[PDB]
Amino acid sequence: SNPRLTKVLDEMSKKPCVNINEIRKMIRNFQPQFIQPRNGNRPNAQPRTVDSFEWVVRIQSTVETQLLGATNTVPQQTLNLDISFTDDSTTITPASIPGSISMLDNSRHIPAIQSMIQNFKARYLGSLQDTAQLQSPQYPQLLAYLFGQLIAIKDRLDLFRPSNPLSLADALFGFTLAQNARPRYDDHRHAKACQGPLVIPAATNSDCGPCGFVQINANQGLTLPLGACLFVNPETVNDQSFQDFLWLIFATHHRMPNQMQNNWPFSLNIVSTCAAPGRQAPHAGELTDERVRLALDTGHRILLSMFNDDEETLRYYQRKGIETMFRPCCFYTEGGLLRKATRYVSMVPLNGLYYYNGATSYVVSPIHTDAHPGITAAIESFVDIMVLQAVFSFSGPKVVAAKVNASQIDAAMVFGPAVAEGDGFVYDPLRPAPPLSAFYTEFIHRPAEQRIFQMAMSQIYGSHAPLIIANVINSIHNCKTKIVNNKLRATFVRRPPGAPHLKADTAIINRFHDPELAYALGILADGIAPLDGSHEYNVLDELDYLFNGGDIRNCFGLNALNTRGLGQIVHIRPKREPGKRPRRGFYTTLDGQVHPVTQDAPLDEIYHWRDHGNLTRPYSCHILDSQGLEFADVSNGRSRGKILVVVNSPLKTCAAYQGPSFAPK
Amino acid sequence: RGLGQIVHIRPKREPGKRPRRGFYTTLDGQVHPVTQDAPLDEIYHWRDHGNLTRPYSCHILDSQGLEFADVSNGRSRGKILVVVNSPLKTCAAYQGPSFAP
Amino acid sequence: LTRPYSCHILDSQGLEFADVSNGRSRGKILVVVNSPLKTCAAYQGPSFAP
Amino acid sequence: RGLGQIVHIRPKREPGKRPRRGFYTTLDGQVHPVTQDAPLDEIYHWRDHGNLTRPYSCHILDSQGLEFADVSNGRSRGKILVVVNSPLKTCAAYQGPSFAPK
Numbered sequence A: 001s002n003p004r005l006t007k008v009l010d011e012m013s014k015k016p017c018v019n020i021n022e023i024r025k026m027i028r029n030f031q032p033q034f035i036q037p038r039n040g041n042r043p044n045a046q047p048r049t050v051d052s053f054e055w056v057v058r059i060q061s062t063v064e065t066q067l068l069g070a071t072n073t074v075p076q077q078t079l080n081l082d083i084s085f086t087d088d089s090t091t092i093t094p095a096s097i098p099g100s101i102s103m104l105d106n107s108r109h110i111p112a113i114q115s116m117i118q119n120f121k122a123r124y125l126g127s128l129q130d131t132a133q134l135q136s137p138q139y140p141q142l143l144a145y146l147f148g149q150l151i152a153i154k155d156r157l158d159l160f161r162p163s164n165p166l167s168l169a170d171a172l173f174g175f176t177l178a179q180n181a182r183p184r185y186d187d188h189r190h191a192k193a194c195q196g197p198l199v200i201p202a203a204t205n206s207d208c209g210p211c212g213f214v215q216i217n218a219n220q221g222l223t224l225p226l227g228a229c230l231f232v233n234p235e236t237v238n239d240q241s242f243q244d245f246l247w248l249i250f251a252t253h254h255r256m257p258n259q260m261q262n263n264w265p266f267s268l269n270i271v272s273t274c275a276a277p278g279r280q281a282p283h284a285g286e287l288t289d290e291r292v293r294l295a296l297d298t299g300h301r302i303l304l305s306m307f308n309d310d311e312e313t314l315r316y317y318q319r320k321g322i323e324t325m326f327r328p329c330c331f332y333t334e335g336g337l338l339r340k341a342t343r344y345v346s347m348v349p350l351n352g353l354y355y356y357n358g359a360t361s362y363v364v365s366p367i368h369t370d371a372h373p374g375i376t377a378a379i380e381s382f383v384d385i386m387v388l389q390a391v392f393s394f395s396g397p398k399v400v401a402a403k404v405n406a407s408q409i410d411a412a413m414v415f416g417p418a419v420a421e422g423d424g425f426v427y428d429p430l431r432p433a434p435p436l437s438a439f440y441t442e443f444i445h446r447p448a449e450q451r452i453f454q455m456a457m458s459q460i461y462g463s464h465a466p467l468i469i470a471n472v473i474n475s476i477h478n479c480k481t482k483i484v485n486n487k488l489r490a491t492f493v494r495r496p497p498g499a500p501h502l503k504a505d506t507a508i509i510n511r512f513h514d515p516e517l518a519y520a521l522g523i524l525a526d527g528i529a530p531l532d533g534s535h536e537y538n539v540l541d542e543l544d545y546l547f548n549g550g551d552i553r554n555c556f557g558l559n560a561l562n563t564r565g566l567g568q569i570v571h572i573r574p575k576r577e578p579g580k581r582p583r584r585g586f587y588t589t590l591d592g593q594v595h596p597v598t599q600d601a602p603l604d605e606i607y608h609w610r611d612h613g614n615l616t617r618p619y620s621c622h623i624l625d626s627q628g629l630e631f632a633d634v635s636n637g638r639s640r641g642k643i644l645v646v647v648n649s650p651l652k653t654c655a656a657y658q659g660p661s662f663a664p665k
Numbered sequence B: 001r002g003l004g005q006i007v008h009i010r011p012k013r014e015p016g017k018r019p020r021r022g023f024y025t026t027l028d029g030q031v032h033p034v035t036q037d038a039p040l041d042e043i044y045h046w047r048d049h050g051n052l053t054r055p056y057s058c059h060i061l062d063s064q065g066l067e068f069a070d071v072s073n074g075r076s077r078g079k080i081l082v083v084v085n086s087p088l089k090t091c092a093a094y095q096g097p098s099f100a101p
Numbered sequence C: 001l002t003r004p005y006s007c008h009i010l011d012s013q014g015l016e017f018a019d020v021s022n023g024r025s026r027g028k029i030l031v032v033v034n035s036p037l038k039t040c041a042a043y044q045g046p047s048f049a050p
Numbered sequence D: 001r002g003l004g005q006i007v008h009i010r011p012k013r014e015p016g017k018r019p020r021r022g023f024y025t026t027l028d029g030q031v032h033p034v035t036q037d038a039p040l041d042e043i044y045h046w047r048d049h050g051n052l053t054r055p056y057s058c059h060i061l062d063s064q065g066l067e068f069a070d071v072s073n074g075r076s077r078g079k080i081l082v083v084v085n086s087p088l089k090t091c092a093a094y095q096g097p098s099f100a101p102k
Helices: A003-014 A020-027 A110-119 A142-159 A168-173 A241-253 A258-263 A289-306 A313-322 A373-392 A437-443 A451-464 A466-477 A515-521 A539-547
Strands: A035-037 A055-059 A062-066 A081-083 A212-215 A228-232 A268-272 A352-356 A399-402 A425-427 A533-536 A585-589 A623-627 A642-648 B007-010 B022-026 B031-034 B060-064 B067-070 D022-026 D060-064
Touching (some): A110 A352, A142 A168, A142 A241, A142 A313, A142 A373, A168 A241, A289 A352, A373 A451, A373 A515, A539 A623
Antiparallel strands (some): A035 A055, A062 A642, A585 A623, B007 B067, B022 B031, D022 D060
């Protein structure tokens, strides 16, 4: 019993959303055109070490409006997307909910492992023949996360070509470092990486690279260690690339923050049937580019075999790991927080029994070889943040404002039309700000911003939907981020810890980036209607739609003429009620003031809004309420013409303007 | 002496139409909005002259969309007593005509 | 986390409860319990008052 | 002038028998093919004279398996005005017989 819900569901059924394969196909293979620090210009030559956490590759995209009837031409705007590309952040949390993390099934690792432990094992420990005690939990997650982090290191070094280079292996290990200095990469204020040169662990009897080793032979003993066990044939253990891959994984695991390092120990250790190949501990210049690449390849093969050859969750965890160092940069001065509350993947210490003999499959294009995986991971994340944006805004702007002496019992005041009763909260400013998990959770549980999310994600990803959905929900539940009174100034990565202040002391908490990108990519978009082609506009009625609780962005008939001469086009007068009583009218802006209008007068000096061109803040709630207005016309015609807007962006996907939406017709 | 614990003011949520911020207009045209329900003494004020207030002060010109709910356990309908012992009282004490008896 | 069986109020007779807030006494709450000794059967066990 | 980000060409989206790929043949012999979605500007990329091209040049002879998806709502159904003034405009200039496609 909800007409809007059923209408939207039927629409989404009519025009299925574009599954992610198109996004991957489009983004996989273009190099960035230019990379520069977010605020300013790049220097002549890049410094020795990435040290300013603002460098961001950007993706230009512009809009030009064009129409006859206006006084002068309209200047073009630059809607460009940015990618953080330097700053670090955590993404792994221990919390969980039912679907947040699942354990794989060792239904094809147990037969072989038992048949290989029954024969080559001293004939005095007894016959095992039970195939039921080999039931340790199967959680091969953290390996993929570390793999992703390693790929991220590689990509970050490649993009920001430093002046004096070093081999990726050399930079990662950091042989020629100082006592407690930062690694060659990731050396800045926010950097979180174990400093100092990496230390090889020890010179024990049974070594097989960085991890422990146990053999199964007659004149020996057998005792499976506690962590994970990767049972492999003697052929590969004595191979070369595999040893290098193990060393690389170990190396990237010891650069995590010390505390998080203690939480999730690197417990891998291999068991086979041949003599232990002593640890090699490469140093100075043993590993080189091609050898590293070969090791990466073999490691990817190993991980795929560990995942029951799933390759869709593997790519998921790999993306999530690579996301600690690449991520989209917000676009609105509000502060770019919608991402910060959706970035957590639950995890558990690795464990289980794994057997690896061959390949069992071949993937045409794995993530680790696609010409800068960082960008593709960042955009793969953005294509989800935008869907979340679309679902939250399904009802209204969902503002959160500040008022002094607000009741510390309930924080729900009605703001007027265009803001549904549920949303539109308020909070005292002089006390610590709210936690921002006290709103989102309340938003994504209703059976209107839930089913939409369900079906949209289902269409985007298909069978491997639940995992993402479940996980993101968990992220919302425990997010410590808080709302703040500051601005990002549109040329920063983080709020400058000075005294930026809000224009209206309020924050809209459901906008992350302009919906135009959502339309272009084909994903779901809401509210705001698309602007790419000829449009019939009726100012005399569009403006009316505005003052009764709209937003200017839908009203592309106004922005065109905002200061091109809208003045001598339309007048506003209080009301001409021919009967009961001649009362006067007024309107309320996003602030409290309720300045009124008494007589006929040109519109240009009654509202007088800032003119950006044809790209205004979509959820700014310019006017909340207004009663008693007429909007007379002051020119025959000249208020029922045409307008043409052209937007060309480099990320136009395959099915660009054929996606579901429910913006006013 | 009360009216901070006896009566509250809240916007009217009666129909299913768009919620609107109730407002009332004082004498000088200062439209006052009432968004979040609050105790009455925090929304409107006026000097206490006991029970002799300026008769025609024209306090509130108009108001639209307002509700008044009490928050005291049924002791908002009390009785009061007033005594006016003026020294220029005459025979026809209160027998004169009026408009609103 | 209050003591489960503290047996606070044994009995009461003749009492009424009326709210004095404009319809914001029926809110929602969220609780998170990330214990480190969670097992596979997270919450699938039987009970008495589901 | 920007036809590029207006229309895409893709091989074919036949929902049944077989996903084969498409190609076109120019006036020369070469039969260079098209496999995936891509902007039109780098698949044909013809010389631009303005609004007066060789009328009988046979730019493309054959093509099988193409779709021409649109990549912008509208922006591909507008108007155009061409003015040609020549000094030899005769008396009855645009009132002569012809059989060009309607």
